[PDB]
Amino acid sequence: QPLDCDDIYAQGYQSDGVYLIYPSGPSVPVPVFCDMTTEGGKWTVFQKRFNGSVSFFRGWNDYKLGFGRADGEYWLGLQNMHLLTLKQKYELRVDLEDFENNTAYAKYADFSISPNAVSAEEDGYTLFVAGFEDGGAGDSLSYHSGQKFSTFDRDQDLFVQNCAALSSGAFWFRSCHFANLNGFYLGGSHLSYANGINWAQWKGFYYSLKRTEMKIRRA
Amino acid sequence: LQQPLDCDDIYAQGYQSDGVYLIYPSGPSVPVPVFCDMTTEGGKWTVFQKRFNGSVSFFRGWNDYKLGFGRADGEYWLGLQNMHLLTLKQKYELRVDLEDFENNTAYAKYADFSISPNAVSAEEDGYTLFVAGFEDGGAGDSLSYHSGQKFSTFDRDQDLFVQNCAALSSGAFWFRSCHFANLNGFYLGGSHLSYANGINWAQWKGFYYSLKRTEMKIRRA
Amino acid sequence: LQQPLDCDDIYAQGYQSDGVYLIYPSGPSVPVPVFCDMTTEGGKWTVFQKRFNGSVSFFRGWNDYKLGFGRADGEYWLGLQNMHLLTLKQKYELRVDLEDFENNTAYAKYADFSISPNAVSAEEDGYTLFVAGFEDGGAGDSLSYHSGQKFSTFDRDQDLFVQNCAALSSGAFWFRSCHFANLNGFYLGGSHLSYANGINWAQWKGFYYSLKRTEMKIRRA
Amino acid sequence: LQQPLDCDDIYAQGYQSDGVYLIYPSGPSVPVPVFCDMTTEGGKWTVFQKRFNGSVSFFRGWNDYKLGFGRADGEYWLGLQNMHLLTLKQKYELRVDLEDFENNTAYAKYADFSISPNAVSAEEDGYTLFVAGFEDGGAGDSLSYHSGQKFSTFDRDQDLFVQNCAALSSGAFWFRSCHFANLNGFYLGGSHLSYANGINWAQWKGFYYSLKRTEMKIRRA
Amino acid sequence: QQPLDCDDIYAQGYQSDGVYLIYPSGPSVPVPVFCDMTTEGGKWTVFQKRFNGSVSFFRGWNDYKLGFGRADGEYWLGLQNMHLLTLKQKYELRVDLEDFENNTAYAKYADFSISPNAVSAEEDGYTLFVAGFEDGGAGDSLSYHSGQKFSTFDRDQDLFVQNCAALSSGAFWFRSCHFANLNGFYLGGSHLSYANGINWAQWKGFYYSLKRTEMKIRRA
Amino acid sequence: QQPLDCDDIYAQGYQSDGVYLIYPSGPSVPVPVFCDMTTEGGKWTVFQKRFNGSVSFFRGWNDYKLGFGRADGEYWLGLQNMHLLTLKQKYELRVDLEDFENNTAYAKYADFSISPNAVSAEEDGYTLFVAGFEDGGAGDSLSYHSGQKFSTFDRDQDLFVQNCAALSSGAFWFRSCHFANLNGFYLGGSHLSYANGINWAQWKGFYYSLKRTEMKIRRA
Amino acid sequence: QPLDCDDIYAQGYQSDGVYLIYPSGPSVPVPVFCDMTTEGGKWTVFQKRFNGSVSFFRGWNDYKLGFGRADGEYWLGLQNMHLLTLKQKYELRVDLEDFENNTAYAKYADFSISPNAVSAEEDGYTLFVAGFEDGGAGDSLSYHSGQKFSTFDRDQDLFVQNCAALSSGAFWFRSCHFANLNGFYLGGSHLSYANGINWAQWKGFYYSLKRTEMKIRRA
Amino acid sequence: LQQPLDCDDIYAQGYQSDGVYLIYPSGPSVPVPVFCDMTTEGGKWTVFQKRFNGSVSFFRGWNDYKLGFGRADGEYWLGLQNMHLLTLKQKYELRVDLEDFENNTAYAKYADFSISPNAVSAEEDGYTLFVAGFEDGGAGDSLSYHSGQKFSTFDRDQDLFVQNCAALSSGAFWFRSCHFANLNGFYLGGSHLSYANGINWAQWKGFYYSLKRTEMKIRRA
Ligand SMILES: [Ca+2]
Ligand SMILES: [Ca+2]
Ligand SMILES: [Ca+2]
Ligand SMILES: [Ca+2]
Ligand SMILES: [Ca+2]
Ligand SMILES: [Ca+2]
Ligand SMILES: [Ca+2]
Ligand SMILES: [Ca+2]
């Protein structure tokens, strides 16, 4: 059984598409989309957005189990992500695109959800990212490292207010985000503050991207 | 030793200044505070919905919308159960008052208004919304599209849509295929390029405009 | 002042037109609307069961039958809990009124009627049905067979039968080995080739005929 | 030490007699028994639905229909979760075989069949039914009307109708405004005067005819 | 005007012992009970009756909170109801027992309360309190139980490593284990198993299951 | 490599009867059981043991599903586990009994299964199936029970208007009522009560409670 | 029915002790101890401590429904408190005593739990206190006004950490308390910081009182 | 392939630096990280308990203590279920390591250690603690008093005391009448005037002294 998608590369499949991996165990699979093309491939994608159809302003439960279609926009589920990061060391890549036909990305050498936590729930699925290699976009996620995942159901952020509610999304919020890749799909520039799909360092807080996907690969 | 269950009684009690007041919709055991608009169109308005600051988030669950949530001073939602108790024992009239970011006001009135009327159990009937004859104010008629629909949240999908229209609209309402009025949407503060997710009154400012103030008022028959 | 808990109270309040009314069986906290037959045999009837249109499906679960379900206007079931509160604090008389598809009317009266009488908890006792002295109307005596039997649903099989008599009969009732009266059966609208699964009153039109209209009425002593 | 997860594997194992067999859709830890129709049209059919006696009641809850219920020997339902595990990891073909009380047989085939395909969580997506190209057998095409609809029960109403079409129909199905096929309805054994609540295939025997036998079969692509 | 206990019913003007409605919660909902208006001046509210052995008292923590049975025959009034009475008035206890040899016995306790002066009965586990004991035919078993939370196979509150409620086939305010198991299995006479029947230790020991049993309550 | 039953343990190379770990669900979680590697060639998995009388078997439906007790002494393996074994292999039944007069007896049944060919054991109530019976000392009581769901005072599945599980002081696949109640109350010898102890009707009748009892399972 | 204890004064009872009042309604009472002696009496007590036996490091549910014995130490319950303050205007008095045979107190004219809130739960049962009349002790509660009630179950405080956990108690915490009348009963001076029954303005953060009770009376 | 279920296996795998490691007590499906003391007395210690900073609160519920809670790096509790999985399949030795605020160290060793040994279900048996032969280190023998006692929390009281000793002690432990060792008490940081509520080892520093560091280690037989 392949638990990640780098295993699937070894299985003998290299066309990027929907695939079944067994992160828990052989009992139940979960379908994911894999980017076998970008930078040698072997990417497991836990986050996809482009159409704007699927709303990512969901509750803590949907974000734990995952939600959406492996074909189009989806969120793999925080629990699944924890099972992968728990048993193997992983690398992060996020790939972004605006409405001006420009692409950008940012890479982080290490990436883990609640690393070395006896229970991910108790630890709030903390996000950890280490060494950052710069692509097109800047470094927004390093600001978020060490923060529990927050939703309008469960406020874990360091802000007196509910930053997840104010930002129209879910993320590992601090005082408030520099990256809200689950914000509301406002499709271009917006006059509201830091509530759309925003990567602060690339296009600021008042610009909502067109496409967004966060990729994961073995060490 | 006599209790006012609605706010039109408070008018009869002898109080006409609009403000916070205690009314007993359940019974003399426990009251619930509300804000009353004793000024607009003769007064006697019981308000079950207020929004203006945008601070309070209305993307809440089915339980919060059943029991009610917020501050009677500022933004709040009275609670679906309370609303059902009032409309169950008296016939009521609806008025909604709206305001945009261009210093313009509008409204719409509905002669009859009830939540799940003559329903032996509101839960089983899903707290259906009923509105009848519509008298035009500044805004158009959006709510008549919603009459007969159960109240839906991201917890409980009652809408007629394959998707969860409450989830797509970032709010709670008596949804059909999807709303013409989402007065519990996200407070996006002005125009927005996203589709039908803010505090939107379709017939007045369309689906791509988020209002500034919003309040839904109720008075005896 | 005291609240009217039954509909004979409402007669004393000064209302004699049969229609939807609010009575407070639990307490002043929450009412439940019911339809009252102020016309039949002097009136003052509280109706805990209505069927005629066939629209509402009565093949529901134990929870819907405990809390009640339907519209006080048309077809509905008041809910066993409410029924227990009435019979617990007052002595009541039963009348069931029936009509077939041949423009014929019939009825049956039972002097005493109670749900789980002298039971410290109605749930534990399964809301046992008790009916006493029977005065003959158009129909025969089918309910006397059912007295002493817990209320059974496809959720909760309480009947004395090895099978699920509630499931085989497409309804809910105080079943024994199996019913002679299934006034919550499936609305099969006339004659049917299936056995004892429609709205059936055995002694009047047998097990292979489903009535058109049905309502079970309750009045003070 | 090698496990057959579907029943086309069992054909490859070296077994071709139609009967009860163990397959491992989840994994080698726990199997789930199913009946396989290795005779019809080349065989290799995995059956997730059987009805004929009418004894087993299919008016069950969302939980019973998620985990599955019944006997692989006689009437049963394999379970929505299991069905989702198979369709998730392989592409499958659908065949439903029907029989009336007049000694007639019919069927309908669909090239593609999947429950909530490519869904990261079946619960969130409501276990939608998808069927593609339809090859006609004896019966017409009722299921294409149902494609894209979440599975609904009287516990969980997902249909596009204001009412609870699962409750009105006395069964569970991927309901829309309401079904053209209710293969989990009440086994009324022949014709019925009530509307669209029995085991009905609309295009073959209409809404007022309840089949005698029913079974839904699945094979690899 | 509503009678909340059965000594009120004496004042209402009813003295024939039978099933009656009292309002311990409030005028909203009554709960029926059987009252023994005959024994020792009357005014007894009965929260426990057993005689046929038909009703099984091996029930869960929830049934014992809300109560179960028929006020006519065997029943249990319910721990919540009992706490409502003992919370608002001071009460006296009497238990009346009978064996299979046509003998009667009893025991009286001056004070009786369930979790007295407790802001929430659930949190305190509905502790039993009994004070000064006046001897009748039977001995004093309940004084051993005073201060103990009510235990069932659902909720083990006893002081024993094992589940004394499970071993005793009943429910009671168990300590290390009972001297009185008035909710045990109705084994109807002698039994070779240990301390699992309707047993009053001080009257007929641990290997004797009574025939009839009822626990009565009256105002102070 | 993991042994799911105890005939696997026989092949592992262990033949001394005692507590062993087997993995009926899967390699994730084991459950310990006692194996009778002595009787009739051995390889017996024991899902039921009684002798001391200490452990009470008048338990709820949840305890009987998940199992309860110590694999050393008296215990019940748990119906869920029992269902996983019978689901994936065909099994043979043997029950071994002993009274208080130093006499032994037994009964064997060729086929034995819990909820066979059931897509979910819960829905089917964990029905008992037993086929061909080879006579030992005791008679055939279980054939009366074949096809009956498992019943407890929590869940009455029996064919009786009353609650046969409650009247019998135990849990079993009851019909109108049992001829074998091997989970009854440990009444330790003769008893004047009717059919509420550990009783095998065909060997020592309804008024005699055995001393030792254990129900064994082996591969086909 | 008397819903408060000033009604009980009118009922005709003036000896301070355990009494039943009906704050919800005639359906269910809740016992309280009333101080009919202090400053004319008519005090309803929602808080008592002296023996130290009852532990006040409890959960949010125990503090909503209440816990303890009306005889000795107890907590009336936040919900009950809300029913009183919702329908009548009330005055606050807290009475304190150290281990040196000294007494002190502080009075606040207005006192309310979640005033004008359609649901107390949603508002977290905010504490409001207005004009303060000085007794022996200083003014610690004015710092707490406007803060939701917090427990180790539910962190509502404005502090990044869980101030309820650090203080060994439950209170309407801000950055952290000046008054922790539900702290751990450390019985005198303690070297730990602000975790005992502490009234900051009277005996500082390193002194745990001996007796404590918070009293309420009609307007 | 080849998975280490304990940390003595990790010694054989070839890792001897004390730190966080993955071991598979359930199975190869899901690991759980633990910290191992490969240094003390030859190493191979699996640590199910660590405390030193005082930051993590151990006044948690029965569910958190069943599933485990904390960070394997710093303070944590491995979880009662995992502990039962280890002790169920192998025989283990116990060592507890203690340190005060006076730069002194102590410990106590127990030859046998088990959670609910030979229990068909840990829940039913309440996860009883068993410890046998005791070898004296710096500290005395407090745990022998606790052997045979179920694990108790303020959620679930299993102790032999009329009160809730877990609640009075501000921690969780296998309580009897009350503890001689409360290694999950509140981190009061030194001496305290309250009775038996801090991280206390009675026989070493009594009931009025709260330790600075605490960790309970486990090794194969
Ligand atoms: Ca926050
Ligand atoms: Ca929908
Ligand atoms: Ca039955
Ligand atoms: Ca619907
Ligand atoms: Ca115990
Ligand atoms: Ca039965
Ligand atoms: Ca905080
Ligand atoms: Ca205790």
Q: Give the CB-side neighbour count of residue B124, counting CA atoms within 13 A.
A: 24
**Contact (CB, 8 A) for F45 and F22:** yes
Integer Cα distance of F100 and D32 in angstroms: 44
Resolution attained, angstroms: 3.4
Chain G residue with minimal CA distance to H168?
G55
3-state secondary structure of D83: helix
Integer Cα distance of D110 and D217 in angstroms: 11
Full 3-state SS string of G188-203? EECCCCCCECCEHHHH
Integer Cα distance of A64 and A69 in angstroms: 15
Integer Cα distance of H85 and E182 in angstroms: 40
Interchain CB contact of C185 with B (< 8 Å) = no
Minimum-distance CB partner of F21 among H89, H123, H124: H89
Name the residue among F113, D125, H31, H97 with its Cα closest to residue A115.
Answer: H31
Least distant ligand from the CA of F167: 6
3-state secondary structure of H78: coil
Chain F residue with minimal CA distance to E162?
F55
Chain C environment of D188 (Cβ under 8 Å)? 194, 197
Q: How many CB pairs under 8 A join B and D?
A: 15
User: Can chain D be said to touch chain E, i.e. do they have 3 or more Cβ pairs within 8 angstroms?
Assistant: no
User: Can chain B be said to touch chain A, i.e. do they have 3 or more Cβ pairs within 8 angstroms?
Assistant: yes
Question: How far does residue H160's CA lie from ligand 5's centre (Å)?
Answer: 7
Q: Looking at residue D5, what DSSP letter applies?
A: S
Interchain CB contact of B162 with D (< 8 Å) = yes
Q: What are phi and psi of H92, to 5 degrees?
A: -130, 155
Q: A177 CB contacts (<8 Å, ≥6 apart)?
A: A140, A143, A144, A163, A167, A171, A194, A198, A200
Output A22-26 pairs: Cβ under 8 A, ≥24 positions apart.
Answer: A23/A80, A23/A83, A23/A84, A24/A80, A24/A83, A24/H29, A24/H30, A25/A1, A25/D27, A25/F28, A25/H27, A25/H28, A25/H29, A25/H30, A26/A1, A26/D26, A26/D27, A26/D28, A26/D29, A26/H29
**Contact (CB, 8 A) for H65 and H193:** no
What six digits make up the tokens of H110? 């127990």
- Strands G188-189, G132-134: pairing is unpaired
Report how this structure was experimentally obtained. Answer: X-ray
Integer Cα distance of D201 and D209 in angstroms: 8
Overall residue count recorded for chain E in this entry? 220
CB contact under 8 A, A68 and D27: no
Name the residue among C20, C28, C23 with its Cα closest to residue C10.
Answer: C23
Q: Report H helices in B90-164.
A: 122-125
Integer Cα distance of H61 and F22 in angstroms: 31
DSSP E strand boundaries for B56-163: 69-70, 76-77, 92-99, 105-115, 129-131, 134-136
Degrees to nearest 5, angle at CA H115 with H112 and H120? 120
Chain A environment of H72 (Cβ under 8 Å)? 116-118
Q: D217 CB contacts (<8 Å, ≥6 apart)?
A: D37, D40, D45, D46, D47, D48, D94, D95, D96, D97
Residue A33: strand pairing partners = A18
Residue B190: strand pairing partners = B210
3-state secondary structure of D96: strand
Chain D environment of C74 (Cβ under 8 Å)? none
**Contact (CB, 8 A) for F26 and D29:** yes
> What's the first-to-final CA gap in chain A, in angstroms?
20
Q: How far is E158 from chain H (nearest CA, A)?
A: 7
Interchain CB contact of B27 with G (< 8 Å) = yes
> What's the first-to-final CA gap in chain B, in angstroms?
25
What six digits make up the tokens of B138? 């500044």
**Contact (CB, 8 A) for B5 and B30:** no
Q: Which chains touch B (3 or more CB pairs under 8 A)?
A: A, C, D, G
Name the residue among H137, H133, H89, H91 with its Cα closest to residue H111.
Answer: H133
3-state secondary structure of H121: coil
Interchain CB contact of D161 with B (< 8 Å) = yes
Residue F216: strand pairing partners = F46, F94
CB contact under 8 A, C193 and D191: yes
Name the residue among H176, H213, H209, H4 with its Cα closest to residue H96.
Answer: H213
Chain F environment of H125 (Cβ under 8 Å)? 70
CB contact under 8 A, A67 and D121: yes
Interchain CB contact of B15 with D (< 8 Å) = no
Minimum-distance CB partner of F192 among E60, E185, E189: E189
CB contact under 8 A, C170 and D170: yes
Chain A residue with minimal CA distance to B210?
A192
- In single-letter form, the type of residue at position D209 comes to Y
CA G125 to chain centre: 13
Residue F94: strand pairing partners = F108, F216
CB contact under 8 A, E87 and G20: yes
Minimum-distance CB partner of F29 among H26, H118, H119: H26
Which residue in D146, D156, D160 has the most chain B C-beta atoms within 10 A of its own C-beta, making it the best mutation to test that interface? Answer: D160
Minimum-distance CB partner of C124 among E21, E26, E68: E68
Q: Looking at residue C186, what DSSP letter applies?
A: B
Least distant ligand from the CA of H152: 8
Q: How far is D30 from chain F (nearest CA, A)?
A: 6
Got the DSSP string for E47-73? Answer: EEEESSS-S-----HHHHHH-EEBSSS
Chain H environment of G57 (Cβ under 8 Å)? 59, 170, 186
Chain G residue with minimal CA distance to E89?
G20
Tell me the Ramachandran region of residue G100: left when phi exceeds 0, alpha when psi lies from -120 to 50, beta otherwise.
alpha
Chain H environment of G208 (Cβ under 8 Å)? 193
Got the DSSP string for D152-163? Answer: B-SSS--SSSSS
Name the residue among D107, D171, D179, D183 with its Cα closest to residue D144.
Answer: D179
Q: Which chains touch F (3 or more CB pairs under 8 A)?
A: D, E, H
- Strands E91-98, E75-76: pairing is unpaired
CB contact under 8 A, A55 and B170: yes
Which residue in H154, H157, H194 has the most chain G C-beta atoms within 10 A of its own C-beta, making it the best mutation to test that interface? Answer: H194
Interchain CB contact of E196 with F (< 8 Å) = yes
DSSP E strand boundaries for chain C: 19-23, 32-37, 45-51, 69-70, 76-77, 92-99, 105-115, 129-131, 134-136, 181-182, 190-191, 200-201, 209-210, 213-220
Question: How far does residue D156's CA lie from ligand 4's centre (Å)?
Answer: 9
3-state secondary structure of E139: coil
Chain D environment of B149 (Cβ under 8 Å)? 162
Q: What are phi and psi of C166, to 5 degrees?
A: -65, -40
User: Can chain B be said to touch chain H, i.e. do they have 3 or more Cβ pairs within 8 angstroms?
Assistant: no
Interchain CB contact of D158 with B (< 8 Å) = yes
Integer Cα distance of H184 and H174 in angstroms: 11
Based on C-alpha coordinates, what's the Rg of chain F?
A: 16
Minimum-distance CB partner of D160 among B128, B148, B162: B162
**Contact (CB, 8 A) for E173 and E128:** yes
Chain F environment of H123 (Cβ under 8 Å)? 66
Question: How far does residue D127's CA lie from ligand 2's centre (Å)?
Answer: 13
**Contact (CB, 8 A) for D180 and D202:** yes
- Strands A90-97, G211-218: pairing is unpaired
Full 3-state SS string of chain F? CCCCCHHHHHHHCCCCCCEEEEEEEECCEEEEEEEECCHHHCCEEEEEEECCCCCCCCCCHHHHHHCEEECCCCEECCHHHHHHHHHHCCEEEEEEEECCCCCEEEEEEEEEEECCCECCCCCCCCCEEECCEEECCCCCCHHHCCCCCCECCCCCCCCCCCCHHHHCCCCECCCCCCCECCCCECCCEECCCCCCECCEHHHHCCCEECCEEEEEEEEC
Least distant ligand from the CA of H161: 8
Only one residue has tokens 């496990």, namely D3
CB contact under 8 A, E185 and F191: no
**Contact (CB, 8 A) for B53 and B75:** yes
CB contact under 8 A, H120 and F19: no
Q: How far is A23 from chain D (nearest CA, A)?
A: 12
Based on C-alpha coordinates, what's the Rg of chain G?
A: 16
3-state secondary structure of D12: helix
Only one residue has tokens 């990891």, namely D89
In angstroms, what CA-CA distances link C11 with A11, C88, C112, C118? 81, 21, 21, 28
CB contact under 8 A, A69 and D124: no
3-state secondary structure of B215: strand
Burial C178-206 (b: 16+ CB within 10 A, else e): bbbbbbbbbbbbeebebebbbbbbbbbbe
> What's the first-to-final CA gap in chain E, in angstroms?
22
Integer Cα distance of E26 and B29 in angstroms: 12
Output B153-160 pairs: Cβ under 8 A, ≥24 positions apart.
Answer: B153/B60, B153/B61, B153/B62, B153/B65, B154/A58, B154/A59, B154/B59, B154/B61, B155/B61, B155/B62, B155/B63, B156/B62, B157/D158, B158/B126, B158/D157, B160/D160, B160/D161, B160/D162
Minimum-distance CB partner of C194 among D59, D168, D189: D189
Chain F environment of D31 (Cβ under 8 Å)? 87-88
Q: How far is H193 from chain G (nearest CA, A)?
A: 6
Q: What are phi and psi of G38, to 5 degrees?
A: -70, 125
Least distant ligand from the CA of F158: 6
Interchain CB contact of C103 with E (< 8 Å) = no
